[PDB]
Structure 1
Amino acid sequence: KVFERCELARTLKRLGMDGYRGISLANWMCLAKWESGYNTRATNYNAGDRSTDYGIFQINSRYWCNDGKTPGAVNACHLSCSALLQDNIADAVACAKRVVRDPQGIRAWVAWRNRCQNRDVRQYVQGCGV
């Protein structure tokens, strides 16, 4: 599914993302926007290293979820990558929280650096009641 902006903001708040490991809600929103356009079924194959990015947060099969076909991969969220293509985002949120528990934090996603870091990100949550 493709969330509307404020619908996702309210959903993420209920799921405990606001301030998780120091990361504001507006930063999570900015990341989902630039990774997937708020689309849970989004996938991107990376032909250069044979891994695939999955779902609303584009989580990578080399480190985070298992898809069987990625060489040298681990599965730190302990999920099939299929779990990250569901319309219900509970598992993908649980996996995103595991990602930012490593030292890099939100910097793990290069699009956060290019598109969100040191910007005015208030725009993503304005008017949503969160």
Structure 2
Amino acid sequence: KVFERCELARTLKRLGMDGYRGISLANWMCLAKWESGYNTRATNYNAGDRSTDYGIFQINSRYWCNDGKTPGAVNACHLSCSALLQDNIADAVACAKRVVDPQGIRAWVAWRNRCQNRDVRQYVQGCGV
């Protein structure tokens, strides 16, 4: 499922992300946009360490979900990575909160790259969130 911009903002808001641990909806939106283009079916294989990024937030197999093929990996969100590839993003959202639980949304390099210290307001404008 490829989410439309405002549809995703409302979906994220309903799932409890607006201001979650200080992170505004605009920031989460900036992350999902650059990570997957609002695409829940997105996957990215990292040949270097044999891990894979899954779903709309492109959560990595080495630490957060289990795919059975990443060497010495863990499963902090306690879910099959398959769960992060569905149309309903509730699981991805609960796992995204865990990723940021330790120390912020800066967990994703892409967010620091194209979201941190940028004008992100555009991502929620007119969405009624």
d(CA) in 2 for partners of 1:46 and 1:99? Answer: 19
Aligned length: 129
| Offset at residue 51 of structure 1 (A) | 0.1
Percent sequence identity over matched residues?
100
Find the residue that maps to 2:72 and give its secondary structure. Answer: coil
Q: Could you state the TM-score of these two structures normalised by the residue count of structure 2?
A: 0.98
Cα distance per residue 1:84-122 (max 9 Å; x no partner)? 00000000000000111x433111100000000000100
Name 1:8's counterpart in structure 2.
8
| Offset at residue 80 of structure 1 (A) | 0.1
Name 1:117's counterpart in structure 2.
116
Find the residue that maps to 1:26 and give its secondary structure. Answer: helix
d(CA) in 1 for partners of 2:102 and 2:52? Answer: 22
Find the residue that maps to 1:114 and give its secondary structure. Answer: helix
d(CA) in 2 for partners of 1:56 and 1:35? Answer: 7
Structure 2: gaps spanning 5 or more residues: none
